[PDB]
DNA sequence: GCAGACACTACGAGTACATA
DNA sequence: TTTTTATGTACTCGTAGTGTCTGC
């Protein structure tokens, strides 16, 4: 099998979720944070022709950056990984799929509860600002029938009170009150526009980011509030 | 059957580790106190400490989370340094369990000295996240848990059963072993050997199983295997007789014979002289053997140091 | 210093408001002030037979043990806690001493040796050079000083006084005075 | 042969280290208990401890892995500090053995005090990786292995053969030595000298070979070499004579002579004074020597601690 | 006879080059030649205990005679991480010249060395082909058993009445030739044979004695002993931490030099007092203090002028 | 192309612990 | 009127020096 700068790209991303990854034969890759805070899944170009466990995902993505695009990835006769570049050959380990934290099946979202979208451009403006503004916690609520995001700094106001930042996401059509609170630490997804499906049942709830390329599902936090 | 098998493993004291809280062999009040919890449906903070290993702590930690359907994160205590708490443990605890499950962090074997600072950072953490998430701690030695942490936890103390519980718990293990035998294909010719395994290393139910593993070499426990478990390799009659007669040439000769396992022989001696000698000579024989035992292993020539015990005895010991 | 009306701000305000953390650093460092060691309150409790005030505190089995070693009258019970000290409750160790050392009094001064650290140097530099230990290194100094005046040996060896070696011998500028002294009168 | 030769080395007690578990000279039940394992084809956690050196522990550790076709990692205990476990040992154990082999980590000589904390981190590790991977530990002194680790392991205890095994095992070694001789070109004129080597330092099969090396100086073992091996001294006359005469300058001088094997010399002393002194001085000589023996090995200067024995004797021992 | 012509100390520049030059008794010289015969060296421990016998010399020799690539290291300097870094950097390394690598450790029977010695158990085995170790000891028991197992333990000295006379003849003939080289003059030939008889087993002393009449070119336990006479403490209490280093040696030099300087019935006590202090050393937590308790015990009961 | 900015490494100082 | 033993190991903090990724 052969991996493309497009997919080597989508993986450096799943490295910010789990240091390792489980990939089974196919066009589809999933991973989940060890502590279950984040779940990613995607369908890909390059085709995955054998199963394997990768303990180091980000360091092997580092070693595949040193060969040519034409390089042929195969299971090694000796069961590890052989990367054959044209003039060269590299040997990288496999761990057993016990020490890498795989989800079982590709967790399907429920019927959503509310839905909005976000433009690629406006994701940039959030992440990039959070650093400066020290926005470590954000909240999706409604304002004037129009859903806004809100940045806060949780250490400064533990209460999510002085809202340091806000971005209006689109019109809110239905009728419900909600404050969903997401830890900036779980936002691991790559940039671009996402359809946003969030769901809540009492002390239940979750937020799915549906991208063009891969899907992302992020846990809410416990002070999150709503009637649904 | 009623027993759990992990079937993903061969090591047998780990193949049979209990799935639920009912399977665990526990003192009366300790079981009751756990069933109670599994009821309330939410788990408080809990410390489970041995200090004798293999009493079920790390099993019950995993158990409780199962019986409550916890959303659980298991952690090696010694891997649990401070920045671990800060990043992953804190992410986990701040995460909304979205299917409405108790979040529980099991920190196994947390009693290392080095982890003090991590445990300190933890003291304000367990308070901030107490609504969402709770912590179960396992330790061999409590004093390695800073006091402020024992305040915050229900401290349950394993392996100190009452005289009544010991007897009952053992009886429960003999049955539990028997049912393992049925499962593994080991056949029991004499039951006395299953009982003797349980009694021999009691407090610890792990080595109690892995002792059954290694005495099953031949696939049967017969009254022969019983000899090794209880092991008395003994005929001490030759020494006892020479001590009565207060001679040396004979004692001096027997010393190099028992130089082999001194630890065992000293036992079989204290055992059989205790009955055969006078009451105030009993208080002495312990002073005499007890001292000889202490300094063994400092003693250069074991054979000689054994002779010195024989002379010491023949002189002061008295009986008919 | 312009503007000439500035309500002189304290050392700290200047630092913090302007944000140069090395100023903040000299400022904080100002509070360094490090001593503590209430050890003698425990020790004096054991001498003068008074109220314990312990296990709430930090006890050095070695501090105590050693402090008491100053007085020949204690030795029997300091010694006892030596052979037997390891594996006694930090508290047990304190309960024993209290039930052991009978009278009480002590004034401070502990015993230390005289170090001609001229002479300490010459010995460690023989010990290093020849990979022999200290007692032999001694014999060395004597048969050199006695015969061969050992200026030569001091002459050839001076080459390595490596200033790190100096870190082993004494702790201060007296060290930098030796640096010169062995480089001198050979 | 039937014998293994490493051929990459000259040091001969290491040229002949047994390849398989059958080659090893072991007590009845200990062999049986290992053959049993090599069968099940998977290895449990195992602790193998002497405390007399060179009984076969570190050999059997390597053996078992061979007879099972383990995928093995060998480690110096003292190099085994905590961050070692964390990085390499943990990488290894988490690695899928892809050809389907048992992974086994042999931690040789793990009984240092300093390694306590590493052993503690290990207690939760051996449980997490128990399906894939197991640990074999070698130690001279058990007490240097934290109890929670002895719970997790099958603890097999070397060098305490039964009266029966000793005899068998020795017989096996006399044959094993003979075959080494054939191989090295040493010729045996008298067999009594091969038997005497084995008996002389028994528990320890290493110095037992390296004693064969150094008594082969002349390339034949004749009844002359037999003299040196069985030799000892027996010449205790110099000390016995100086003790009668109750002088010091002489005794004080003899001390450094016997400082070499103290354990032997104390034996030959108790043996020969027992006949040459009065009956109530016999009860004292045991007290005197018995005590001196106990504290040996605590004693800093062995030579001096031997002098202190001589003075003690010359004063109280009274006899003709 | 060998001379190392860049060295300034007698005993260091006249150190025997070969296993021949050394003066030894019978089974000693045989057993050494028998060893160098095989051209590869096993593990070896050498011990006197009566010092100045040639321990440390015979080691550097056996190496020489095998064309061994030899790393000499003092025991006192052989700490745990010394072993880890260099000594391992050494025995792990293959040699260009394809010789045997050998590590001499002089006087390994010191104290802190204890945990190091345990590191070696599994080291001496792990490079057992490349290299081997020669260990020197004044007291054996100060070498943990699992090392004594790995090593061949040869034990020096105690020559026959015959060896005596021949050795004494050798040493005298040897000293002469040294005087020739150094430009020291022999006025009488009974002064030479005095020196050899005087301190006989100890040839190092006897060469050290000679480096002390040599100003012309022709033929320290005092501090403690003085404080013990004076029966004071402030001084004794101060000296304890000084000798805390090698306790085993110090106790020897003490029993040696007090035996002459104290009364006859006080000799029987000094042994009881030091003999006991020796026994319990190594149980004793603070070695420095346990040494103080010896000083006090002595100053009180020891009586003399 | 560089210079600037961010992230990850390592060493030094401090601290605490256990065995001798 | 006081005042710090030796040897090994582990965790955390702080900073400074190294890198790579990025922006005229
Ligand atoms: N057997 C010997 N023959 C010749 N010289 C000796 C002998 N033993 C010791 N010496 C003298 O002692 C010096 C070194 O002694 P050394 O081997 O260090 O004794 P030790 O090993 O007992 O400390 C040598 O320079 C040597 O001349
Ligand atoms: Mg556990
Ligand atoms: Mg070994
Ligand atoms: Mg020397």
Domain chopping of chain C, boundaries: 1-34, 35-112, 113-186
- Other Cβ atoms closer than 10 A to D46: 22
Are E129 and D8 inside 8 Å of each other by CB?
A: yes
Cβ–Cβ < 8 Å for E76, E212:
no
- B156's enclosing H/E stretch is strand B154-157
CATH tag for E220-305 (out of 3.30.565.10, 3.40.630.30, 3.30.70.120, 1.20.272.10): 1.20.272.10
CATH 3.30.70.660 given to domain D1-162: no
- Per CATH, is B230-320 categorized as 1.20.272.10? yes
Around ion ligand 2, residues with a beta carbon closer than 5 Å are B 58
Q: Which residues are paired to E185 by β-bridges? A: E218
> Which structure tokens are listed for C108?
């401070």
Q: What is the CATH number of domain B163-229?
A: 1.10.8.60
Comparing CB atoms, the residue among D151, D156, D160 nearest residue B261 is D160
Q: Tell me whether residue D185 is annotated as binding.
A: no
E241·C113 Cβ contact <8 A: yes
Residue B98: CB partners within 8 Å, gap ≥ 6? A204, A205, A206, A219, A220
Helix extents (H) in chain B: 28-40, 57-67, 82-84, 90-94, 116-128, 147-152, 163-184, 192-200, 206-214, 225-229, 237-244, 249-258, 262-276, 279-295, 302-316
Tell me which method was used to determine the 3D structure: X-ray
- Is B96 in contact with A220 (Cβ distance < 8 A)? yes
Task: Kindly report each contact of residues E256-262 with a partner whose C-beta sits within 8 Å and lies 24 or more positions away, as own/partner.
Answer: E257/E221, E257/E225, E258/E225, E258/E228, E258/E298, E258/E302, E259/D248, E259/D252, E261/E225, E261/E304, E262/E302, E262/E303, E262/E304
The shortest C-alpha distance from C133 to chain E (Å) reads 7
Ligand at shortest distance from the CA of B78: 2
SS3 per-residue string spanning chain D: CCCCCCCCCCCCCCCCCCCCCCCCCCCHHHHHHHHHHHHHCCCCCEEEECCCCCCCHHHHHHHHHHHCCCEEEEEEHHHCCHHHHHHHHHHHHHECCCCCCCEEEEEECCCCHHHHHHHHHHHHHHHHCCCCEEEEEEECCHHHCCHHHHHHCEEEECCCCCHHHHHHHHHHHHHHHHHHHHHHCCEECCCHHHHHHHHHCCCCHHHHHHHHHHCCCCCEECCCHHHHHCCCCCCCHHHHHHHHCCCCHHHHHHHHHHCCCHHHHHHHHHHHHHHHCCHHHHHHHHHHHHHHHHHCCCCCCHHHHHHHHHHHHHHHCCCC
DSSP B4: -
Closest protein residue to G15 using CA and C1' atoms? Answer: C22
Subunits in contact with chain D (3 or more CB pairs closer than 8 Å): A, B, E
Counting as contact any 3 or more CB pairs under 8 A, the partners of B are A, D
Positions on chain G within 7 A of a protein C-beta: 1-13, 15
- Domain C1-34 in CATH 6.10.250.1260? The answer is yes
Chain B residues interacting with chain A (CB cutoff of 8 angstroms): 71, 73, 88-89, 91-92, 94-100, 131-132
Cα separation of D298 and E280, whole Å?
Answer: 6
Do D86 and D121 meet the contact criterion of CB atoms below 8 Å apart?
yes
CA–CA–CA angle A8, A12, A14 (5° rounding) = 115
The DSSP line for E26-82 is HHHHHHHHHHHTTSS---EEEE-SSSSSSHHHHHHHHHHHTT-EEEEEESTT--HHH
Cβ–Cβ under 8 Å, residues E55 and E135: no
DSSP run (H or E) holding A91: strand A89-92
CB D121 within 8 A of CB D113: no
3-state DSSP percent of chain A in helix, strand and coil, to 5: 15, 40, 45
Listed residues: CB within 5 A of ion ligand 4: E 56
Cited resolution, angstroms = 3.5
Chain A residues lying within 8 Å of B97, measured CB to CB: 203
Roughly how many angstroms between the first and final C-alpha of chain D, as a whole number? Answer: 60
- Pick the residue of A181, A222, A223 with the most B CBs within 10 A to test the interface with B by mutation: A222
Domain containing A152 equals 2-228
Are D297 and B295 a contacting pair at CB < 8 A?
no
Backbone angles phi, psi at B292, to 5 degrees: -55, -35
Residues 81-140 of D with CB under 7 A from strand G: 81-83, 112, 114-115, 117-118, 121
Residues 6+ apart with CB under 8 A from E1: E14, E21, E174, E177, E178, E181
D269 half-sphere exposure, CB direction, 13 A CA radius: 30
Strand F nucleotides with an atom less than 7 Å from a protein beta carbon: 16-20
| E79 CB less than 7 Å from any atom of strand G | yes
Chain-chain contact of D53 with E149 (C-beta, under 8 angstroms): yes
Q: Is E11 annotated as a binding residue?
A: yes
Q: Is the CB of E138 under 6 A from ligand 1?
A: no
- Nearest-angstrom CA–CA distance, B136 and B109: 10
Nearest ligand for residue B59 CA: 2
Q: Looking at domain E161-219, which of 3.40.30.10, 1.10.8.60, 3.40.50.720, 2.40.110.10 is its CATH number?
A: 1.10.8.60
Nearest beta carbon to residue E249 from set C62, C135, C153: C135
Q: Residue E211: CB within 6 Å of ligand 1? A: no
CA–CA min distance E169, chain D (Å): 24
Interface test with E, best of C143, C150, C158, C165 (most E CBs within 10 A): C143
Whole-angstrom distance, CA of residue A165 vs CA of residue E246 = 71
Chain E nearest-CA distance from D141, in A, is: 11
Distance, Å, B184 CA → F17 C1':
45
Query: Which chain B residues touch A222 with a CB distance below 8 Å?
Result: 94-96, 131-132
Task: State in Å: Cα E204 to ligand 4 middle.
Answer: 9
CA–CA dist A109, E167 (Å, integer)? 97
Q: Round to whole Å and give the CA distance between D208 and D201.
A: 6
Closest-CA residue of B relative to D269 is B304
Torsion of CA B194, B200, B203, B209, to 10 degrees: -40
Quick check: helix, strand or coil at residue A19?
Answer: coil
Cα distances (angstroms) measured from residue E31 to each of B94, D10, D217, E38, E157 = 75, 18, 7, 12, 13
Q: What is the CATH topology of the domain spanning C35-112? A: Zinc Finger, Delta Prime; domain 3 (1.20.272)
Helical (H) or strand (E) element with A180 = strand A178-183
Distance B133 CA to G8 C1' (A): 39
In sequence order, what are the residues at sequence separation of 6 or more whose Cβ sits closer than 8 angstroms to the Cβ of residue C28? none
Cis bond leading into D276, ω under 30°? no
* B112: nearest CB among D120, D134, D163: D120
C-beta separation of B59 from B18 below 8 A: yes
E237 to chain C, any CB pair closer than 8 A? The answer is: yes
Distance F16 C1' – B144 CA (angstroms): 13
Footprint of strand F on the protein (CB under 7 A): B 113, 116; C 62, 86; D 113, 116; E 114, 282, 285-287
What gap in Å lies between CA B239 and CA D319, rounded to an integer?
Answer: 29
CA distances from D313 to B252, D248, D283, E87, E278 (A): 20, 11, 12, 46, 18
CATH number for A113: 3.70.10.10
Touch between C and A (at least 3 CB pairs under 8 Å)? no
A and D: number of Cβ contacts within 8 A? 28
User: In the numeric block, which tokens belong to residue D241?
Assistant: 């004579």
Ligand nearest to the CA of B52: 2
Contacts of E273 (CB under 8 A, 6+ apart): E294, E297, E298, E301, E302
Query: Is E2 labelled as part of a ligand binding site?
Result: no
**What's the CATH architecture for E1-160?**
3-Layer(aba) Sandwich (3.40)
Residues of chain E positioned with their CB less than 8 A from the CB of D111: 118
β D187-188/E101-106 pair status: unpaired
| Å separating the CA of residue A64 from the C1' of nucleotide G20 | 17
Q: Rounded distance, CA D169 to CA D158, Å?
A: 12
Ligand 1 pocket test target in E45, E177, E203, E211 with most atoms within 8 Å of CB: E203
Q: Does domain C113-186 have CATH number 1.10.8.700?
A: yes
Cβ of E57 less than 6 Å from ligand 1: yes
Contact A96 D91 (CB under 8 A): no
Give the CA-to-C1' distance from B144 to G10 in angstroms.
Answer: 15
In this complex, the residue of A35, A186, A201 whose CB is nearest that of residue B73 is A35
Distances (CA, A) of B8 to B5, B11, B15: 9, 10, 8
Residue with tokens 């190092």: E204
Looking at the complex, report in whole angstroms how far the Cα of residue D181 sits from the nearest Cα belonging to chain E. 16
Give residue numbers, 37 to 96 of C, with CB < 7 Å from strand G.
37-40, 43-44, 60, 62-63, 66-67
Other C-beta atoms closer than 10 Å to the C-beta of B217 total 19
Each domain of chain D, given as residue ranges in start order, spans 1-162, 163-229, 230-320
């Amino acid at each position: 099998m052969k991996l493309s700068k497009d997919t080597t790209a989508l993986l450096k991303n799943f490295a910010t979720i789990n240091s390792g990854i489980m990939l089974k034969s196919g066009q589809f890759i999933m991973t989940r944070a060890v502590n279950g805070t984040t779940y990613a899944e995607a369908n890909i170009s390059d085709v995955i022709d054998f199963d394997v466990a990768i303990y180091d995902l980000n360091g092997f993505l580092g070693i595949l950056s040193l060969v040519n695009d034409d390089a042929e990835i195969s299971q090694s006769e000796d069961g590890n990984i052989k990367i054959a570049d044209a003039r060269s050959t590299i040997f990288w380990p496999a761990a057993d799929p016990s020490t890498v934290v795989a989800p079982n099946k590709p967790i399907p979202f429920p019927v959503a509860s509310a839905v909005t979208e976000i433009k690629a451009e406006d994701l940039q403006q959030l992440l990039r600002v959070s650093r400066g503004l020290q926005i470590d916690t954000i909240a999706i609520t409604v304002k004037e029938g129009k859903i806004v995001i809100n940045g806060f700094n949780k250490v400064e106001d533990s209460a999510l009170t002085r809202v340091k930042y806000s971005l209006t996401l689109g019109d809110y059509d239905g009728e419900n009150t909600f404050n969903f609170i997401i830890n900036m630490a779980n936002m691991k997804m790559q940039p671009g526009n996402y359809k946003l499906l969030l769901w809540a049942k009492g002390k239940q709830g979750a937020a799915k980011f549906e991208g063009e390329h891969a899907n992302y599902v992020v846990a809410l936090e416990a002070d999150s509030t709503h009637d649904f | 059957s009623m027993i759990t098998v992990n079937e993903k493993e061969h090591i047998l004291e780990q193949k049979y580790r209990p799935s639920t809280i009912d399977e665990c062999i526990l003192p009366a009040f300790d079981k009751e106190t756990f069933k109670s919890i599994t009821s309330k449906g939410k788990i408080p903070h809990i410390i489970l400490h041995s200090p004798s290993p293999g009493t079920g702590k790390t099993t019950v930690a995993k158990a409780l989370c199962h019986d409550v359907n916890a959303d659980m994160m298991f952690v090696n205590g010694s891997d649990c340094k401070i920045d671990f708490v800060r990043g992953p443990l804190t992410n986990f605890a701040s995460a909304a369990s979205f299917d409405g499950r108790q979040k529980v962090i099991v920190i196994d074997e947390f009693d290392r000295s080095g982890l003090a600072e991590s445990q300190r950072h933890l003291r304000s953490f367990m308070e901030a996240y107490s609504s969402n998430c709770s912590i179960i701690i396992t330790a061999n030695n409590i004093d390695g848990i800073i006091k402020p942490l024992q305040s915050r936890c229900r401290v349950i103390t394993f392996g100190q059963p009452t005289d009544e519980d010991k007897i009952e718990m053992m009886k429960q293990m003999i049955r539990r072993l028997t049912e393992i035998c049925k499962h593994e294909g080991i056949a029991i010719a004499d039951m006395k050997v299953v009982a003797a395994l349980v009694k021999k290393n009691f407090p610890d139910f792990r080595k109690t199983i892995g002792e059954l593993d290694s005495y099953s070499s031949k696939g049967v426990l017969d009254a022969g295997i019983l000899s090794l478990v209880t092991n008395d390799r003994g005929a001490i009659d030759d020494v006892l007789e020479s001590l009565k007669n207060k001679d040396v040439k004979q004692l001096r000769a027997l010393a190099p014979k028992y130089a082999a396992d001194y630890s065992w022989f000293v036992g079989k001696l204290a055992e059989e002289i205790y009955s055969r000698v006078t009451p105030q000579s009993i208080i002495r024989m312990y002073e005499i053997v007890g001292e000889n035992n202490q300094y063994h292993g400092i003693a250069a020539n074991t054979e000689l140091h054994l002779a010195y015990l024989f002379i010491q005895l023949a002189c002061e010991m008295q009986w008919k | 210093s312009l503007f000439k009306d500035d309500i002189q701000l304290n050392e700290h305000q200047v630092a913090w408001y302007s944000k140069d953390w090395t100023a903040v650093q000299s400022a904080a460092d100002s509070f360094k002030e490090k001593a503590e060691n209430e050890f003698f309150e425990i020790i004096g409790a054991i001498n003068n037979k008074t109220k314990c005030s312990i296990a709430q505190k930090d006890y050095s089995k070695f501090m105590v043990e050693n402090a008491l070693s100053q007085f020949p009258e204690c030795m029997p019970a300091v010694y006892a806690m030596n052979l037997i000290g390891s594996g006694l409750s930090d508290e047990a160790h304190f309960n024993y001493l209290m039930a052991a050392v009978p009278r009480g009094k002590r004034y401070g001064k502990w015993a230390k040796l005289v170090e001609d650290s001229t002479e300490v140097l010459i010995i460690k530099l023989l010990a290093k050079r020849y990979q022999v230990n200290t007692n032999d290194a001694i014999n060395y100094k004597s048969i050199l000083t006695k015969n061969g005046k050992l200026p030569l040996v001091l002459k050839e060896l001076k080459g390595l006084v490596t200033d790190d070696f100096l870190k082993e011998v004494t702790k201060n500028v007296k060290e930098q005075k030796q640096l010169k002294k062995l480089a001198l009168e050979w």
